[PDB]
Coordinates of C-alpha atoms in Angstrom, one line a residue:
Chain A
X32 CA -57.9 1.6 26.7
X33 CA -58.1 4.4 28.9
X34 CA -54.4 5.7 29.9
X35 CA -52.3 3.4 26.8
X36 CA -50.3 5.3 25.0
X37 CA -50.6 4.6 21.1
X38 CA -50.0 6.6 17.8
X39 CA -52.5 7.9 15.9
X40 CA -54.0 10.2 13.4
X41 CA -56.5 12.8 13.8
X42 CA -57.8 13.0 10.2
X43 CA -58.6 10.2 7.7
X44 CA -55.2 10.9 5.5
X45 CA -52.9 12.3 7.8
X46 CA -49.9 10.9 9.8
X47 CA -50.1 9.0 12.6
X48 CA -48.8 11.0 16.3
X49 CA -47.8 9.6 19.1
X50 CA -50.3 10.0 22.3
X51 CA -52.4 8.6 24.9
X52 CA -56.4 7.5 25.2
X53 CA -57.7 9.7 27.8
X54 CA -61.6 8.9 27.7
X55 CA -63.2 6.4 26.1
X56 CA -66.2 8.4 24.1
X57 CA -68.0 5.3 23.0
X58 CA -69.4 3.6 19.8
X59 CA -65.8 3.5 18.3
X60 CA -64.9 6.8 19.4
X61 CA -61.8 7.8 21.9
X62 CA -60.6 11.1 23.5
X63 CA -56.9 11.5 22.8
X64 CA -54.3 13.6 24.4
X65 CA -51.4 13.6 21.6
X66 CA -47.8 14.4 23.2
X67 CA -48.3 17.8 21.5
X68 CA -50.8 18.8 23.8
X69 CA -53.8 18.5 20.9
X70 CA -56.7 16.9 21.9
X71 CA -59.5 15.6 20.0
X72 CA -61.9 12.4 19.4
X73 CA -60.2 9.9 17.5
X74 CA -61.6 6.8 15.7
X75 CA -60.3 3.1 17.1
X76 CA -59.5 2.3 13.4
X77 CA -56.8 5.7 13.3
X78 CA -55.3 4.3 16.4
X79 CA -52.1 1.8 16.9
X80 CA -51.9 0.5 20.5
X81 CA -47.9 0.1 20.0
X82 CA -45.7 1.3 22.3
X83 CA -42.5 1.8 21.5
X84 CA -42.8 2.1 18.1
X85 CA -41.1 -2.1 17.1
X86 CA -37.8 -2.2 16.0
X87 CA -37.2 -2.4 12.1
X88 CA -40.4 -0.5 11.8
X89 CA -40.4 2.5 8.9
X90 CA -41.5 5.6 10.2
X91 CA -40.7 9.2 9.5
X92 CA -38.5 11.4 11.7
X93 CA -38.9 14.9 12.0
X94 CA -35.7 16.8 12.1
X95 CA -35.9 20.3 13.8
X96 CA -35.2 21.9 10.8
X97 CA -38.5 21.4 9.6
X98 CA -37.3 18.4 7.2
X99 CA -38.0 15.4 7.7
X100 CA -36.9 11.7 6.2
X101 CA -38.3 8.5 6.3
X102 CA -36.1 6.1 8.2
X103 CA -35.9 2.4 10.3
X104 CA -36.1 2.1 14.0
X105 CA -33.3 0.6 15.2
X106 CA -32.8 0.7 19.3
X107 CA -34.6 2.5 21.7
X108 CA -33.5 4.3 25.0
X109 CA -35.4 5.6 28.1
X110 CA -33.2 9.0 29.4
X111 CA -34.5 10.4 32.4
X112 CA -38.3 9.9 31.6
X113 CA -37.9 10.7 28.1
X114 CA -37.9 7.5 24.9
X115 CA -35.6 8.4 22.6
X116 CA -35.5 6.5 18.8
X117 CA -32.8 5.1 17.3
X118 CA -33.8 5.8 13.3
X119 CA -31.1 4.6 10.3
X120 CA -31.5 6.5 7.3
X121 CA -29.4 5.3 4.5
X122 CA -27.1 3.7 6.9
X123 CA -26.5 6.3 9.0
X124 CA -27.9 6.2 12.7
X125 CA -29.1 9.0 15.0
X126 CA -31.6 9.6 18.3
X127 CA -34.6 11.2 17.9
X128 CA -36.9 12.2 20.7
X129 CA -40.6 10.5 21.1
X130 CA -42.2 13.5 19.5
X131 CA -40.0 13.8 16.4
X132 CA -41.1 10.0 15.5
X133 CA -44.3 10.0 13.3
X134 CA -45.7 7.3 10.5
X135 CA -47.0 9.1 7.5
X136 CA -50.5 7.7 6.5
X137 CA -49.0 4.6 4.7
X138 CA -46.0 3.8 7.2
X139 CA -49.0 3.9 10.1
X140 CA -51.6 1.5 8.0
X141 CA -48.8 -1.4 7.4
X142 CA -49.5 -1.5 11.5
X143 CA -53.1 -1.9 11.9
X144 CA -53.8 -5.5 11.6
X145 CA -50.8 -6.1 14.3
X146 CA -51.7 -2.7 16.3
X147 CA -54.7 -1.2 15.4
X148 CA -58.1 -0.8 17.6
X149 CA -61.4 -0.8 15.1
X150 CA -63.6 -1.0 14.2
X151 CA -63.1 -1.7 11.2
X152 CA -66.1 -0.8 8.6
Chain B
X5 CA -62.6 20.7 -3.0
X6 CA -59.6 19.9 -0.3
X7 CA -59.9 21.2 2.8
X8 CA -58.2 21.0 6.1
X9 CA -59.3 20.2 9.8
X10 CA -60.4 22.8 11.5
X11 CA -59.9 23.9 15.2
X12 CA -61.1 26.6 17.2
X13 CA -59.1 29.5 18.3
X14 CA -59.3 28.8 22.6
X15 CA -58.3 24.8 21.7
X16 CA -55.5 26.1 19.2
X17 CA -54.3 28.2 22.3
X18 CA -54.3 25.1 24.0
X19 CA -51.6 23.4 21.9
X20 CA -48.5 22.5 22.9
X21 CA -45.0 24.2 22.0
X22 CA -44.6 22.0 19.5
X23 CA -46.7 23.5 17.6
X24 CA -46.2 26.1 15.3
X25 CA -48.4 28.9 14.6
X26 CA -48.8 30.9 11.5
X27 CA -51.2 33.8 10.4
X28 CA -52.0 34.7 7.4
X29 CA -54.1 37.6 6.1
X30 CA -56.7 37.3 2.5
X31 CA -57.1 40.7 1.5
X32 CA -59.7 41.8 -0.8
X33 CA -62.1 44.2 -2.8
X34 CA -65.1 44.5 -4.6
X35 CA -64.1 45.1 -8.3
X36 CA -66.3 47.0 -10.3
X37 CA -63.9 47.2 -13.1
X38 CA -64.0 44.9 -16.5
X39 CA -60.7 43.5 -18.0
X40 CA -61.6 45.0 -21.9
X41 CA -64.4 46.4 -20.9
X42 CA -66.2 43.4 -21.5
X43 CA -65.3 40.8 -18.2
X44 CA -66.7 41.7 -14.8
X45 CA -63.7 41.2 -12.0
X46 CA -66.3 40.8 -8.4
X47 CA -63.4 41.3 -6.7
X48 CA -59.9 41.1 -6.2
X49 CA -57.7 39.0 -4.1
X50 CA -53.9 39.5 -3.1
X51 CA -52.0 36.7 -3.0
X52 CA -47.8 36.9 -3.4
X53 CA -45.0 34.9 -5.3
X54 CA -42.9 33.5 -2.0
X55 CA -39.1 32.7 -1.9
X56 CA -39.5 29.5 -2.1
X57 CA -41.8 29.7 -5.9
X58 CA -44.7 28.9 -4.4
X59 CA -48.2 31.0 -4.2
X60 CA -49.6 31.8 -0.8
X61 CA -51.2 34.8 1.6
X62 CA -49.0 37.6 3.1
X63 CA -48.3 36.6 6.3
X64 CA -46.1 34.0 8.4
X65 CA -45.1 32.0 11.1
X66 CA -45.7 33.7 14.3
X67 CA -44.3 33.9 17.9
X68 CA -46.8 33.0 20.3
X69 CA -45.3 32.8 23.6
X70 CA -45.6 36.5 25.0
X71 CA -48.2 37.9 21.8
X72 CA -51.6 37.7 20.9
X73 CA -51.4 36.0 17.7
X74 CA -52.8 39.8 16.0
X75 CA -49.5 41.2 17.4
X76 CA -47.5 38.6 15.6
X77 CA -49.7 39.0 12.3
X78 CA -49.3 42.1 12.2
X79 CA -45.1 42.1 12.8
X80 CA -45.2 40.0 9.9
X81 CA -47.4 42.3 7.8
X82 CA -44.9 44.9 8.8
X83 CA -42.2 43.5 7.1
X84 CA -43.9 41.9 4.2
X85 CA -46.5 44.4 3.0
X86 CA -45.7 48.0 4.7
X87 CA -48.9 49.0 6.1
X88 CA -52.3 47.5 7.8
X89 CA -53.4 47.2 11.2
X90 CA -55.5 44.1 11.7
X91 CA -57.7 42.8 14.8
X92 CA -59.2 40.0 16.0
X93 CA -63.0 40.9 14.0
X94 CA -60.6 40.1 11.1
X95 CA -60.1 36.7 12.3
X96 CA -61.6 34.2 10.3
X97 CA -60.9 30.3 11.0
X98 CA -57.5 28.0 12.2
X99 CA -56.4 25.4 10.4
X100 CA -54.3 22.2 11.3
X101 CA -52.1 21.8 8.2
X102 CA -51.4 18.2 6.4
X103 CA -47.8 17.5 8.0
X104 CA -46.1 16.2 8.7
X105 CA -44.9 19.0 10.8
X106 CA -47.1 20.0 13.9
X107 CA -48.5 23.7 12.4
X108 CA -51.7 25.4 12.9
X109 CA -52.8 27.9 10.3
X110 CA -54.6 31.2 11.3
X111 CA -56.7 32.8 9.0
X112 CA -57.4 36.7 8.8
X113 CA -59.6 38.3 5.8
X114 CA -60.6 42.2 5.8
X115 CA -62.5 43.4 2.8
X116 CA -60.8 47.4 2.1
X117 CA -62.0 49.6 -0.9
X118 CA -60.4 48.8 -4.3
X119 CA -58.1 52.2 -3.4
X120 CA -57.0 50.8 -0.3
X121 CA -55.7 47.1 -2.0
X122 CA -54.0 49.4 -4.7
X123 CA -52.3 51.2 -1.4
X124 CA -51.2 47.9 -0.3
X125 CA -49.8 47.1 -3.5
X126 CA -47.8 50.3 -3.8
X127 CA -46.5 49.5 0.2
X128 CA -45.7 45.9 -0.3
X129 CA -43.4 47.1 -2.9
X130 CA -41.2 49.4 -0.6
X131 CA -41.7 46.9 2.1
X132 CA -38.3 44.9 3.9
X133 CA -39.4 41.8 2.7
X134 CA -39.4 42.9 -1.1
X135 CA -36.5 41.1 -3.2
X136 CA -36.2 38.5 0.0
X137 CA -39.1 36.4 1.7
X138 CA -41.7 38.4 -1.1
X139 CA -41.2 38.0 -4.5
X140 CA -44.3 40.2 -5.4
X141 CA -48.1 40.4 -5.1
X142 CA -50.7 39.1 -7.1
X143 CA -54.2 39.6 -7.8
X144 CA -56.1 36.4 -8.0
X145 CA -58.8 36.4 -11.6
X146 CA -61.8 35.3 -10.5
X147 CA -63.8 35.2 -13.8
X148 CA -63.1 32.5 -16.3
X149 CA -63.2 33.2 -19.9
X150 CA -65.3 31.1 -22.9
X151 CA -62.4 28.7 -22.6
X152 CA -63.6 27.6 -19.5
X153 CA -59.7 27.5 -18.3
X154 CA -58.7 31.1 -18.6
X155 CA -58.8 33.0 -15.7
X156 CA -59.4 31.5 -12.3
X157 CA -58.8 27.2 -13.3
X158 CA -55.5 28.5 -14.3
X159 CA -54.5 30.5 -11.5
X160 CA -55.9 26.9 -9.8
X161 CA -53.1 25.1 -11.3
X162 CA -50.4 27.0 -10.3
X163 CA -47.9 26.4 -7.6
X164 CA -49.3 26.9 -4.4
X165 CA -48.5 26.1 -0.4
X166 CA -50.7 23.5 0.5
X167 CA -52.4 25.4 3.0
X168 CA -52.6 28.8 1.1
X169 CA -55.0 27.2 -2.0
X170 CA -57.1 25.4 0.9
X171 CA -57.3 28.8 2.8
X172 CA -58.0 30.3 -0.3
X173 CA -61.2 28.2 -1.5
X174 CA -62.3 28.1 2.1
X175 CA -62.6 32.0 2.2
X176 CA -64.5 32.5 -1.3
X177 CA -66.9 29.9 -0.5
X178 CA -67.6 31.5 3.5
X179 CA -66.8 34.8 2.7
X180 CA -70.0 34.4 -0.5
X181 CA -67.3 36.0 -3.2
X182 CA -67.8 32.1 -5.0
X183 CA -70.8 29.9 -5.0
X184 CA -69.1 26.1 -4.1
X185 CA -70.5 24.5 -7.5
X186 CA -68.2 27.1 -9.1
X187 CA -65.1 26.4 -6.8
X188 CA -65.4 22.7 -7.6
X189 CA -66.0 23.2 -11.4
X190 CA -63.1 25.7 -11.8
X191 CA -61.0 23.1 -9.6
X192 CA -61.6 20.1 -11.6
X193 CA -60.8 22.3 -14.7
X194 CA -57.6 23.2 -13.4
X195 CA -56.7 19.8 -12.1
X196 CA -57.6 18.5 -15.5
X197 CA -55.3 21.1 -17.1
X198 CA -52.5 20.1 -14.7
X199 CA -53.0 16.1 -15.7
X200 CA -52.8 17.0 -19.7
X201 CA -50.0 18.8 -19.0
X202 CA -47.7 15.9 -17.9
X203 CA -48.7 13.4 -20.8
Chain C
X5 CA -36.4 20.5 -21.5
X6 CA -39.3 21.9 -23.7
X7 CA -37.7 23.9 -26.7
X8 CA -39.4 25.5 -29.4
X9 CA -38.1 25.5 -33.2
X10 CA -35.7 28.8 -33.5
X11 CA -36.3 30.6 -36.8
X12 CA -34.2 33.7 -37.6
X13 CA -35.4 37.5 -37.5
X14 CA -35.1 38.7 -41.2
X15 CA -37.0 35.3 -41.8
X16 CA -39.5 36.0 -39.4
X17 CA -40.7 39.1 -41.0
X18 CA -40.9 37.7 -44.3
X19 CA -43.8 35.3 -43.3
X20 CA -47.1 35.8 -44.5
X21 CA -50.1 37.5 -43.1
X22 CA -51.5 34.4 -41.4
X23 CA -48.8 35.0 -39.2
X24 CA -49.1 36.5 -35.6
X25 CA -46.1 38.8 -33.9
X26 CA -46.0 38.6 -30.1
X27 CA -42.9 41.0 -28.2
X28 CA -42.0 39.7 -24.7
X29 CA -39.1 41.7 -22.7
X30 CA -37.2 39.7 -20.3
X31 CA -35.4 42.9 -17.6
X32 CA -33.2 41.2 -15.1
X33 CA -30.1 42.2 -13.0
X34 CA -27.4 40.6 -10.8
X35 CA -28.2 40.4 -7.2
X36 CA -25.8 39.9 -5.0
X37 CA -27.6 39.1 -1.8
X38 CA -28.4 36.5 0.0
X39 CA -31.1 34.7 1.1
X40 CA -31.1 33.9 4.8
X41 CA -28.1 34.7 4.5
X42 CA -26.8 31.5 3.3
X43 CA -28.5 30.9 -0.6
X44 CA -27.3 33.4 -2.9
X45 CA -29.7 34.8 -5.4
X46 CA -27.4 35.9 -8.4
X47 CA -29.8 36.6 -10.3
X48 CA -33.1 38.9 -10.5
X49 CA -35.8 38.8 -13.2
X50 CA -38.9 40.0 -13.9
X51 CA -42.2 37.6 -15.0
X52 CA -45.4 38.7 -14.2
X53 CA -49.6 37.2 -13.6
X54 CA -51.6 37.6 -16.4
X55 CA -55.4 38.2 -16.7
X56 CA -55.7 34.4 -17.7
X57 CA -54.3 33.2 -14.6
X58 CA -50.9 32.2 -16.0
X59 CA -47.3 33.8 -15.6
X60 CA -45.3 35.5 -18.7
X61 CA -43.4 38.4 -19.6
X62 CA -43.9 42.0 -20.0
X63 CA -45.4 42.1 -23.8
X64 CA -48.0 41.4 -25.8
X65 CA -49.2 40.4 -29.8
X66 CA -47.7 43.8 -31.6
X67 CA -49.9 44.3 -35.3
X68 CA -47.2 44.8 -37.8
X69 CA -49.5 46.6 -40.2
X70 CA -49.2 49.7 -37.7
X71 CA -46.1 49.1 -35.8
X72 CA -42.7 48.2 -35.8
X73 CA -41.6 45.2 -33.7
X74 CA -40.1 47.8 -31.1
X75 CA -42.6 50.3 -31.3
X76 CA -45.2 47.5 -30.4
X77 CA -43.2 45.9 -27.7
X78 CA -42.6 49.8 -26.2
X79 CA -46.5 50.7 -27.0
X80 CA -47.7 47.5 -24.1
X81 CA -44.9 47.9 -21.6
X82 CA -45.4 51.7 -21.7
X83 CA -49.0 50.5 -20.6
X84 CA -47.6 47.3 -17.7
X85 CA -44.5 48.9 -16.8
X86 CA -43.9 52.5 -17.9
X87 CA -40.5 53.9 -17.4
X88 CA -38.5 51.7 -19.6
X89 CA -38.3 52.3 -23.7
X90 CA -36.1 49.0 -25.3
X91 CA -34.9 49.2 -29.0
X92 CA -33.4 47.0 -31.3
X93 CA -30.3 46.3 -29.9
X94 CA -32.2 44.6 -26.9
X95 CA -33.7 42.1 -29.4
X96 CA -32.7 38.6 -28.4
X97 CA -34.6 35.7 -30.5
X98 CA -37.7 34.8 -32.2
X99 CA -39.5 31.5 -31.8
X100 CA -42.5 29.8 -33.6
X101 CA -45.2 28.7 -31.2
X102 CA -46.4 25.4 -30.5
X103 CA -50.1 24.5 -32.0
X104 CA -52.7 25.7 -32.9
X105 CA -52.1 29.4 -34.1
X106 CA -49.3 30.5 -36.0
X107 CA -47.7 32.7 -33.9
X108 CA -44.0 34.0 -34.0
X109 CA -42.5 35.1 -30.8
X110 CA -40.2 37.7 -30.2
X111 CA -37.8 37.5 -27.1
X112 CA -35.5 41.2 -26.2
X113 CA -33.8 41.7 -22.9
X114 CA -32.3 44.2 -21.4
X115 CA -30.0 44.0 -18.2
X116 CA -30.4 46.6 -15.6
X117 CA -28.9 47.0 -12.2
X118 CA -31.2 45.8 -9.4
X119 CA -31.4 49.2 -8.6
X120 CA -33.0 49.9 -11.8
X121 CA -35.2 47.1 -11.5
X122 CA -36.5 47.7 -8.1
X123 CA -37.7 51.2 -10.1
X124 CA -39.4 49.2 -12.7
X125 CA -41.0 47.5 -10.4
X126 CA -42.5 50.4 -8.4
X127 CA -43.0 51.8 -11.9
X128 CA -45.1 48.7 -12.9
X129 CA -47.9 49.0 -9.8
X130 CA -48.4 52.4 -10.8
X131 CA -48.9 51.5 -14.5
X132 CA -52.4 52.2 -16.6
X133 CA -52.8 48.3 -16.8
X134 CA -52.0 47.1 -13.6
X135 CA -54.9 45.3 -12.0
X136 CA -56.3 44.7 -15.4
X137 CA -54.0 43.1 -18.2
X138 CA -51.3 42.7 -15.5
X139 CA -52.6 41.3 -12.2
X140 CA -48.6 41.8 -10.7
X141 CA -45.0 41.4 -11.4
X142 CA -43.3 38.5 -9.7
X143 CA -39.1 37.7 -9.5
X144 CA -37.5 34.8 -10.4
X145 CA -36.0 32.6 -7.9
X146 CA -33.1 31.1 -9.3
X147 CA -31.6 29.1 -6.1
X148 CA -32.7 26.0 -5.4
X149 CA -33.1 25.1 -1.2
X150 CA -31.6 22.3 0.2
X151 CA -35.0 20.3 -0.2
X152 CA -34.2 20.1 -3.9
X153 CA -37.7 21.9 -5.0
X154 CA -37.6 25.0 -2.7
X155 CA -37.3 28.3 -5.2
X156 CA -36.3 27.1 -8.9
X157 CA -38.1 24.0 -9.2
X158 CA -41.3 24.9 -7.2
X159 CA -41.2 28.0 -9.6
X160 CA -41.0 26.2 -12.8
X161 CA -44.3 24.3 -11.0
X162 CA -46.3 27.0 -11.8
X163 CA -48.7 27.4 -14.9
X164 CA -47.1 29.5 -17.5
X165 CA -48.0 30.3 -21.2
X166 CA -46.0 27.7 -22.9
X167 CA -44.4 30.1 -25.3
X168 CA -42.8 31.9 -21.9
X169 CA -41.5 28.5 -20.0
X170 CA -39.6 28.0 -22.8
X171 CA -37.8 31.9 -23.6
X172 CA -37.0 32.0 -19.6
X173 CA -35.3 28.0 -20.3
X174 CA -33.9 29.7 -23.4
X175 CA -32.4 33.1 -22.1
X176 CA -31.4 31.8 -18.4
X177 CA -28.6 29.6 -20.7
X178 CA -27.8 32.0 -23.4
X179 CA -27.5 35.1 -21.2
X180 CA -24.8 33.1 -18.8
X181 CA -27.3 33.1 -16.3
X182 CA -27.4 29.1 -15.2
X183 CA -25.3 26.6 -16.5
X184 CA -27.5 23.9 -18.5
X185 CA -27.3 21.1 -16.2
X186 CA -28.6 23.2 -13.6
X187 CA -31.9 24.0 -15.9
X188 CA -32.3 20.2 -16.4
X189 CA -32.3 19.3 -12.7
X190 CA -34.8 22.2 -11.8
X191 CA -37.1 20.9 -14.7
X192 CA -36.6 17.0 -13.5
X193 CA -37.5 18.6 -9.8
X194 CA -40.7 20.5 -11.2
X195 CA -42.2 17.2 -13.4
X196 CA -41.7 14.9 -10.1
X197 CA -43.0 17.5 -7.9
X198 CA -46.2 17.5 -10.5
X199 CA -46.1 14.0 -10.2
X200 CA -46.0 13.8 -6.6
X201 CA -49.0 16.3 -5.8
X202 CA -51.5 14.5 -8.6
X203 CA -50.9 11.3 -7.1
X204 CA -52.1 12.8 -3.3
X205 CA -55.7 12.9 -4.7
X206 CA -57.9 11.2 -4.4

C-alpha cells in the first residue's frame, strides 16, 4: 500500500483528506503524508484506497472563503500535474483543486465497503 | 468531555500552507474574592463576545510565513486587547480543529495578578478591535451555585467556537484550576440544560 | 418567537405583595460602521454576563417597600455601570415572567449616541460590581453573515435568562430596530443551529 494515494481521516469523527501511504507501520497501522503536508499514523479502517474520488460521488468542497458545500463529482481533469474536480452543487458546476475536495465523516463511510483498507473490528 | 487532537509545536511547523494557524491566549487569576460574600471565585478567566456571537479566547488567526507564531499572537493581542507581551513559556498545547477546514489551534495561558486581568479589561476596552472583531470581555464563573446549573454549567451552554470551549476545558483540567470529575459533571449539567431547552 | 404575557404599568403596581419587581435598562445607539467593511452594524446595544453564567441587561429585582421603580433601577446600574441616571420617561414595558416565581419585569431604554455608549462602557469596567455581579458587558450583533448563523443567530444561541431573550425580541421590533421577519429568521437560525450541535454528540 506503500506509495497509493487514498483519502483519509486522521481522527475517529473527522473528515476524510486526501493523501498518500508512506510506511506501512504494521498491525493495521499506516504512516500517511496528507497533501497538506500533515503526517501522522492512520488506521486501515480511516482509509479509502480511491483515486480519483468516482464520479457521482457526494463529497464536500472547500471554497477559499472558508465555506464550504456539499456537492457531486461530476468530471475530472488532470492540468499540468494537478487533478482538478468537477463538483455540481444545486445544478451549478465548478473546478475545484485536489485539496479543496474532502468527505465529511459520513460522505467518507458510504465508501468503505467499496474502498476502505481494515481492519475492521 | 470533547477534546481535540493534539500535535506538537515542531510537527505543526511542519504543516503545509494550507494550513491555517491561529493563537489564542487564556488569561487568568487567582480570585480571592466572594460574589455576596458568601461564594468563593478560585479564579477568573477572560473569555470575549466575537463578531460573529459566539464565545472564544482573545486572539486570532496568524501569519506564519516570516513570524514566529509569538510575533503573530501578539499582533493580534495588539489590536484586540491593548496591552500584553507574551512568549513562548506561555505556550501551552496545538490543536488540530474539527474541519472541515485545514486549521491548527495554538494555545497560550499566563496566569497575572487579579490587578493585572482588571488592567486588561480596562485596555481591551480602548483597544482597535472594540465595537468590530470584539464585542467585549468576559469573565468565565467558575463556582456553581445550590442549583447545580448556576454559574459555570451555564456559562457551559452558551454559544461557543468549537475550538474555544475545547481549549477552555483542556486548560482548567492541565492548568489544575478544575479537577476533571468536575468538568464532566458541570458539562453534562449544561448539556442537559441545553436539551430541556429545545423541548 | 418566545413572548411573554404584556400587562400594563399602573396594573403592575397594583399587584400584591407576593409579587416580585425586576428593572432591566436596554442603552443602545445607531452605528453606522461596517463590519469588514461590507456588513453594516446599524445598530449597538448593550447585554452583559451575569454571575450565573447567563447573559441579561443592566438591572436587577428593585424592593418596592424602599424604592421607587427608578430609583431601584438607578440604585444597581449606579453599581454595574455608573455614569448613567434613567427616569421615567425611559420606561418602556413590563412583562410577567414565565414559572415558577411571580415576578413582574420592567423593561426602560434609553438611546444614546455610540459615542455615549462607548463611555458607558468604559464606565461599566470601572464599576463597584464588575467582576462580581457583572462578569462584563457584551454588544449586540444585529447582522447576520452570509453563512446564515454568523452574528444574530449564533447570538440568540447563547444561554440567556428567559425573561431577557424575550425584552431584547420585544424592544428590537418596537424601537424600529429589525423588522419582524428578520427576528423570526434569526430565531429559526438559532433553534437549528441548537439542533445541529446536540445531534454531533455522541
Amino acid at each position: 500500500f506503500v506509495g497509493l494515494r487514498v483519502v483519509a481521516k486522521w481522527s475517529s469523527n473527522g473528515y476524510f483528506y486526501s493523501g498518500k501511504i508512506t510506511r506501512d507501520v504494521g498491525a493495521g497501522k499506516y504512516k500517511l503524508l496528507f497533501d497538506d503536508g500533515y503526517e501522522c499514523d492512520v488506521l486501515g479502517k480511516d482509509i479509502l484506497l480511491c483515486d480519483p474520488i468516482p464520479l457521482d460521488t457526494e463529497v464536500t468542497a472547500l471554497s477559499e472563503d472558508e465555506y464550504f458545500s456539499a456537492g457531486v463529482v461530476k468530471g475530472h481533469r488532470k492540468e499540468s500535474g494537478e487533478l482538478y474536480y468537477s463538483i455540481e452543487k444545486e445544478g451549478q458546476r465548478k473546478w475545484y483543486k485536489r485539496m479543496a475536495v474532502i468527505l465529511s465523516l459520513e460522505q467518507g463511510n458510504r465508501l468503505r465497503e467499496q474502498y476502505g483498507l481494515g481492519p475492521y473490528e | 468531555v470533547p477534546e481535540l487532537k493534539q500535535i506538537s509545536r515542531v510537527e505543526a511547523m511542519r504543516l503545509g500552507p494550507g494550513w491555517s494557524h491561529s493563537c489564542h491566549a487564556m488569561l487568568y487569576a487567582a480570585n480571592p474574592g466572594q460574589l455576596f460574600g458568601r461564594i468563593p471565585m478560585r479564579f477568573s478567566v477572560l473569555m470575549q463576545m466575537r463578531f460573529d456571537g459566539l464565545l472564544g479566547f482573545p486572539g486570532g488567526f496568524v501569519d506564519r510565513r516570516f513570524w514566529s507564531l509569538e510575533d503573530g499572537l501578539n499582533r493580534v493581542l495588539g489590536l484586540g486587547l491593548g496591552c500584553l507581551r507574551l512568549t513562548e513559556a506561555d505556550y501551552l498545547s496545538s490543536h488540530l480543529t474539527e474541519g472541515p477546514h485545514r486549521v491548527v489551534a495554538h494555545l497560550y495561558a499566563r496566569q497575572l495578578t487579579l490587578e493585572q486581568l482588571h488592567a486588561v479589561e480596562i485596555s481591551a476596552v480602548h483597544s482597535r478591535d472594540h465595537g468590530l472583531e470584539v464585542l467585549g470581555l468576559v469573565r468565565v464563573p467558575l463556582y456553581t451555585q445550590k442549583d447545580r446549573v448556576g454559574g459555570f454549567p451555564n456559562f457551559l451552554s452558551n454559544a461557543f467556537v468549537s475550538t474555544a470551549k475545547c481549549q477552555l476545558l483542556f486548560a482548567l483540567k492541565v492548568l489544575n484550576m478544575m479537577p476533571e470529575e468536575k468538568l464532566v459533571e458541570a458539562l453534562a449539567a449544561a448539556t442537559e440544560k441545553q436539551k430541556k431547552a429545545l423541548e
